[PDB]
């Protein structure tokens, strides 16, 4: 669904960095490690967290019984 | 304020005893029971 | 939580699996020393738990039909007759709350019929409490003459990892969850890194599941340098080893070429005799809580002919001792216990 | 304790109930999967308590584990540790292992507890270093042989055993006796211990024990065993890797 | 140990034995009954003569 | 000091020493009749 | 074929000794194996 | 033999950098038994503020409750303790819950669609869409709403992500926030990461001069082997530095002409704090907490 | 069906396919098995109770 | 004021007659003292045998058993051991602050 | 120089469904047989 | 037969605990 509060592993605040990273995607146009290291993500464990997050919750968001069409 | 949402145009529209079960501004036949202003305890764990 | 596997094979994007994902990549450690992994028992990380790892949910629909051609049952609730306490779970149309708590034996719905002239409820019973997460009113089968008599009920059953769940990784080694160690007992890394997921060395010499070894040293060589790798098979050859192409990844980044991680005890603090093998393994859930068939009875209810424990673990049920246990009693010469 | 299908006696015996705060389920020792042919894979088990004395003493007394230590079919063993205890044995009993007074008193009381009642002497009795100068330094084996001497009976002489081992002399080096078991007056003064000497394994140190003291002295051995090699597989741990 | 059952308390809470009361046993008896059947070691039943 | 101690049920053992150990030979053959159809016979 | 045997029994006017595990349990009688092999009597002081 | 006194000469402390976040600092000559047990109590035992009652009015939105809860507890609170108190378990909620032992925080978000040109940006086509901990507003209550004047509470990272909304979608709920230990649950511990690293030996047989000295030194990161001239033989400049890959050691020119251990009396600990209290403060409590726990067995009567 | 290479350097397509036909077969005669040791035992255990 | 008489407990059924050995068990305690304590103990030259043993996981005990050779009895060398572990605490405490001012 | 996942490509399409051809044709290529099989009820030649 | 590619520029990401990518 959405990004994770903390690493799994150690406890690392990942959550408020899934954002971030794409605009380092985007528009910074840098790599996939790069990204994450000027975040400040440096284990391996960190690491992971948030290059290997898929965030459905873009796709279930789309069905909205609350909004016409 | 009682609620009930339509399935298809998703309006807001409640109706009382001894009316047809169908949405007001169309011909819809389910009705999605919405959620109202209720407590409900839970453990941030 | 769904993630996207590290190491996959190429064939995974072309199907677009990252739409429906099916695990999470974990901290795995090939190590034996908790004590309560052995053959067919892994370890789960306590905080890791703690901080939604591996967690699910499960999602159960109900039909609640009025049929059993004159409307005689009526959603909603009879005047003059009321019993204590319902109103907490059921709104004034008879219909739960959607988002209200519910345990076995507290109102799912309530109706009035004509015939017997009383307030009668429809109860939910089940040993897993549940949440309510859609009430839907269908009124169909009918051109003029419209009322509600079929209501679809969605429960909402909260699935946290027990002891007994059965975990994965995508090489056929799948084992129970044998305890929740905690992150202060679990053996930490040189890094700083407890693994999320524990699996015994002695699974390996057996099951002879090598993809997993090099999955291991592919998914750490992944997550560090931040790029995903193949996994498809028939790509490496004998020349070119895959323990060695991600061993030199390994080395690259500063780590262990052959997969390997100096760890200290959690109880002791001492470095360990050898380096553990850890790395990054694609675990999946599976879908079963095991402990489905959990049992206790002393005395519960007994069948009129035999007045033996009647069958049924819901009913206070008993236990069955058989004609192989009758046996077994007999050949220990046991015969008070027989008796 | 039964798991079905119930092929064999051993499959139904006396176990001591242990209740252990904030558990879901049936916790159950290694030492027990032989007889029960139980594999902890989601198998299912029964419980059963008898209501009377005559049927409580028959399952502590006649249907009890310790007296299911061999099995009627061919009188050869069913009971012994079975995985990570096996390697942590071939690592602690090895010649490289070395101990300090501070690690080796810790591995006896790790798994020998006197108010548990595991002592015979009320007193934790230990043997002096292998080594003693320059540093006080006990070996592996030592620990193998402090552990008996604290389970087996002071009245009786400890056991004198010459046994062998699965793992060749050719594996330990040039000249090694190390295959070669031997137990003398209860003290292991050659080879290493395998699934031949602490496992469901014939004429080995267990079943070596279980003839000369009895099953109740064989029962306290493995229970003993396979707390120390728990202990021993934590502070020590034991690995599986590519280099391997 | 290798002879002993780890039991849930669910089950401890629920599998009783008649123990009959007497002089030696009174004290580890009336414990169990004030602890009653939700608090182990507890009871759930007392039988009069 | 090895001796059967009398009321051992010898014919249960028995019949659970030729039954349980027979399971093991479940699988076919790798001329003559052999595991549980010989057994049977 | 539990009639079967029963139809042969009450034709013979047999007697069921109770002397078998089988029909021991049928009656709720004590199993002669083992523990049942035999019979407990208390030594009482007073003639 | 060990006398405290004797422990006080040859104890010592090394602090390579003390961020506001991270500390990284060393314990010198000092039993891993000691070293351990910090480790232990500055993840498990020192007490933090976390959010443990989250009270839902309403939730709209296509995060569950239980999902939206368990997030808000693992948000870390830049709340210090010793300012609340710990709260009994066993009396009633009305008597439980005070302005000494909880704190409030609510959540009320609404979601609704705003006119923008057309790929388009959620916070351009509609309002309110993504919930973030920032959104956790504070209310103090009772006899002490004064104390928290110059003290508010934030969470200590403010743009994590809690929940993502639609138009018609609402989120309404007041979170009890209170004393916890890291043994309980991982949301409590006052630490990101508390561990310590032994630090690496390189124990040099041969003086292994020439070019295999500049072979030697590529089998090490670059500030750990450091070579003088040609000759003048290969040594160790930083062995801190040293990641322990073991590289030297799968080379037969180098496998029997050098050795790899450790300082078993040397620790080196790295702390970082979730945002509640600063490293050293974590550390310090971890220390208390170990005296205390050795002097309520001291001041004890041993029963039996 | 002469498998040359090994699990750690990896088999080829050829070798996977005849890998595959030697591991099913196993697991084949595991669900072809009506030989069941339950009655066997039965009929001795009911005549040496 | 009330002492709480459940956290340290002495196993009479373990204990020497004079007493120079006892087993003591501890609640809510793990290895986190556990192993810390059992090594200021040692460091006591009197003692003659000391260790720690955690019974189960599940059960929140910790057991430390205390052989000491004569002219002290094991409660004196736990009092002495929770007493050196105070002052080694302290010793660690004022290295820190006086190295963070250095700084 | 490697085989790497779309990380950009993914969550931009998960926020915008494609208006035109479907991506992972293969996907609609694994129930070819089924939608074919139905199709050939009505459409194709002969009827 | 053509070799599986190997990624390129393939840097260290991984130092000690109180160092950072200042060593190039
Ligand atoms: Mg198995
Ligand atoms: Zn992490
Ligand atoms: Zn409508």
């Given at each position: 669904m959405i990004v994770p509060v903390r690493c799994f592993s150690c406890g690392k605040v990942v959550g408020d960095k899934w954002e971030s990273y794409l605009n380092l995607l985007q528009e910074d146009e840098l790599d996939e490690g790069t990204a994450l290291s000027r975040l400040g993500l440096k284990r391996y464990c960190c690491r992971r967290m948030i290059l290997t997050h898929v965030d459905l919750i873009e796709k279930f968001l789309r069905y909205n019984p609350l909004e016409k069409r | 304020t009682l609620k009930y949402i339509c399935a298809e145009c998703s309006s807001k529209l409640s109706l009382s005893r001894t009316d047809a079960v169908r949405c007001k501004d169309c011909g819809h036949r389910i009705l999605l029971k919405a959620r109202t202003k209720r407590l409900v305890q839970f453990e941030a764990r | 939580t769904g993630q996207t596997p590290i190491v996959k094979a190429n064939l995974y994007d072309d199907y677009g699996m990252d739409n429906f994902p099916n695990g999470f990549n974990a901290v795995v450690a090939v190590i034996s020393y908790t004590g309560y992994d052995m053959d067919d028992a892994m370890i789960i990380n306590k905080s890791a738990d703690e901080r939604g790892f591996g967690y699910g949910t499960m999602y159960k629909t109900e039909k609640v039909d009025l049929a059993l051609d004159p409307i005689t049952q009526h959603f909603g609730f009879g005047n003059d007759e009321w019993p204590k306490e319902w109103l907490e779970k059921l709104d004034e149309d008879g219909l739960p709350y959607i988002g209200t708590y519910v345990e076995e034996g507290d109102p799912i719905c309530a109706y009035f019929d004509d015939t017997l002239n009383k307030t009668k409820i429809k109860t939910y019973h089940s040993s897993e409490p549940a949440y309510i997460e859609e009430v839907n009113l269908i009124g169909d089968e009918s051109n003029k003459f419209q009322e509600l008599q079929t209501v679809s009920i969605k429960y909402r059953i909260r699935r946290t990892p027990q002891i007994g769940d059965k975990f994965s990784s995508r090489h056929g080694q799948k084992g129970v969850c044998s305890r929740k160690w905690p992150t202060i007992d679990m053996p930490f890394s040189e890094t700083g890194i407890q693994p999320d997921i524990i699996i015994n060395?002695?699974?390996?010499?057996?099951?002879?599941?090598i993809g997993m070894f090099v999955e291991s040293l592919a998914g750490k060589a992944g997550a560090l340098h931040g790029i995903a790798q193949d996994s498809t098979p028939w790509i490496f050859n004998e020349d070119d080893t895959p323990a060695d192409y991600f061993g030199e990844q390994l080395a690259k980044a500063g780590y262990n070429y052959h997969g390997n991680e100096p760890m200290y005890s959690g109880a002791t603090g001492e470095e360990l005799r050898a380096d553990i093998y850890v790395g990054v393994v694609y675990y999946q859930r599976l879908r079963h809580m095991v402990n489905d068939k959990f049992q206790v009875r002393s005395t519960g209810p007994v069948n009129s002919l035999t007045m033996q424990p009647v069958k049924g673990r819901k009913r206070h049920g008993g236990i069955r001792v058989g004609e192989m246990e009758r046996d077994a009693l007999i050949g220990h010469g046991t015969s008070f216990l027989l008796q | 304790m039964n798991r079905q299908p119930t092929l064999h006696k051993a499959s139904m015996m006396g176990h001591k109930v242990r209740v252990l705060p904030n558990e879901k389920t049936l916790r159950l020792h290694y030492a027990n999967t032989g007889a029960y042919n139980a594999d902890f894979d989601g198998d299912e088990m029964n419980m059963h308590f008898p209501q009377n004395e005559n049927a409580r003493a028959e399952a502590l007394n006649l249907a009890n584990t310790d007296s299911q230590y061999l099995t009627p079919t061919s009188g050869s063993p069913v009971r012994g540790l079975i995985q990570d205890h096996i390697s942590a044995g071939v690592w602690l009993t090895s010649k490289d292992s070395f101990f300090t007074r501070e690690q080796y008193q810790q591995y006896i009381y790790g798994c020998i507890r006197p108010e548990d009642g595991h002592t015979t002497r009320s007193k934790i009795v230990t043997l002096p270093p292998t080594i003693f100068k320059p540093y006080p330094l006990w070996t592996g084996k030592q620990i193998i042989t402090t552990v008996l001497l604290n389970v087996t009976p002071p009245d009786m002489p400890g056991i004198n055993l010459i046994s062998k081992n699965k793992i060749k002399n050719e594996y330990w080096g040039k000249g090694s006796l190390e295959n070669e078991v031997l137990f003398k007056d209860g003290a292991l003064l050659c080879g290493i211990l395998d699934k031949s000497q602490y496992g469901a394994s014939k004429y080995g140190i267990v079943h070596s024990l279980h003839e000369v003291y009895g099953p109740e002295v064989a029962a306290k051995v493995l229970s003993v065993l396979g707390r120390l090699f728990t202990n021993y597989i934590t502070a020590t741990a034991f690995t599986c890797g590519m280099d391997d | 140990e290798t002879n002993e059952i780890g039991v849930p308390p669910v089950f401890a809470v629920k599998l009783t034995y008649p123990e009959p009361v007497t002089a030696y046993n009174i004290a580890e008896l009336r414990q169990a009954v004030i602890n009653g059947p939700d608090k182990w070691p507890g009871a759930t039943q007392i039988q009069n003569e | 000091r090895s001796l059967i101690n009398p009321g051992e049920a010898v014919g249960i053992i028995a019949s659970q020493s030729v039954g349980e150990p027979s399971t093991q030979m479940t699988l076919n053959t790798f001329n003559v009749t052999l595991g549980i159809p010989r057994l049977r016979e | 074929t539990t009639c079967q045997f029963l139809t042969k029994a009450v034709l013979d006017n047999e007697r069921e000794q109770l002397d078998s595990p089988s029909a021991r349990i049928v009656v709720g009688k004590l199993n002669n194996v083992g523990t049942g092999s035999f019979d407990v009597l208390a030594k009482v002081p007073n003639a | 033999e060990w006398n405290v006194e004797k422990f006080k000469k040859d104890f010592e402390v090394n602090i390579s950098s003390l961020d506001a976040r991270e500390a990284n600092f060393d314990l010198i000559n000092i039993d891993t038994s000691i070293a351990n047990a910090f480790r232990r109590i500055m993840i498990s035992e020192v007490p933090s503020v976390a959010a443990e009652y989250v009270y839902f009015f309403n939730n709209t939105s296509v995060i569950q409750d239980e999902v939206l809860a368990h997030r808000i507890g693992l948000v870390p609170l830049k709340v210090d303790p010793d300012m609340l108190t710990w709260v009994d378990s066993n009396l009633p909620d009305d008597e439980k819950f005070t302005d000494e032992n909880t704190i409030v925080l609510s959540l009320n978000v609404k979601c609704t669609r705003n006119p923008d040109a057309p790929s388009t940006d959620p916070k351009e086509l509609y309002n309110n869409a993504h919930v973030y901990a920032r959104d956790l507003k504070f209310e103090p209550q009772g006899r002490q709403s004064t104390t928290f004047a110059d003290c508010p509470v934030v969470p200590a990272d403010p743009d994590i992500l809690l929940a993502k909304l639609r138009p018609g979608q609402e989120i309404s709920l007041k979170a009890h926030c209170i004393l916890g230990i890291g043994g309980d649950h991982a949301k409590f511990s006052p630490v990101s990461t508390a561990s310590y690293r032994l630090l690496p030996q390189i124990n040099i047989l041969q003086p292994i001069k020439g070019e295999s000295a500049r072979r030697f030194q590529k089998c090490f990161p670059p500030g750990v082997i450091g070579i003088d001239?040609?000759?003048?033989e290969a040594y160790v400049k930083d062995a801190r530095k040293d990641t322990v890959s073991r590289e030297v050691l799968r080379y037969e020119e180098f496998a029997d002409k050098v050795k790899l251990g450790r300082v078993r009396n040397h620790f080196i600990f790295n702390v970082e704090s979730a945002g509640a209290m600063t490293p050293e403060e974590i550390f310090f409590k971890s220390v208390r907490i170990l005296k205390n726990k050795a002097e309520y067995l001291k001041n004890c009567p041993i029963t039996q | 069906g002469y498998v040359k290479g090994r699990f750690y350097s990896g088999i080829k397509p050829q070798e996977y396919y005849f890998h595959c036909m030697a591991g099913r077969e196993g697991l084949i005669d595991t669900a072809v098995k009506t030989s069941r040791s339950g009655y066997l035992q039965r009929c001795l255990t009911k005549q040496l109770e | 004021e009330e002492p709480d008489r459940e956290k340290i407990k002495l196993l009479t059924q373990a204990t020497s007659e004079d007493g120079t050995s006892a087993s003591f068990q501890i609640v809510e305690e793990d290895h986190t003292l556990g192993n810390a304590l059992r090594y200021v103990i040692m460091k006591n030259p009197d003692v003659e045998f000391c260790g720690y043993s955690i019974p189960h996981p599940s059960e929140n005990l910790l057991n430390i058993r205390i052989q000491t050779y004569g002219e002290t009895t094991a409660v004196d060398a736990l009092q002495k051991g929770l007493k050196d572990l105070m002052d080694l605490c302290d010793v660690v405490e004022s290295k820190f602050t006086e190295k963070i001012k250095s700084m | 120089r490697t085989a790497d996942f779309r990380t950009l490509e993914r969550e931009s399409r998960f926020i915008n469904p494609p208006k035109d051809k479907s991506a992972f044709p293969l996907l609609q290529e694994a129930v070819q047989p089924h939608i074919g099989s139905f199709n050939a009820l009505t459409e194709g030649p002969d009827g | 037969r053509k070799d599986v590619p190997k990624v390129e520029g393939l840097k260290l990401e991984h130092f000690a605990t109180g160092y950072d990518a200042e060593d190039f």
């Open positions: - | - | 060395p002695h699974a390996f010499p057996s099951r002879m599941t | - | - | - | - | 001239e040609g000759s003048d | - | - | - | -």
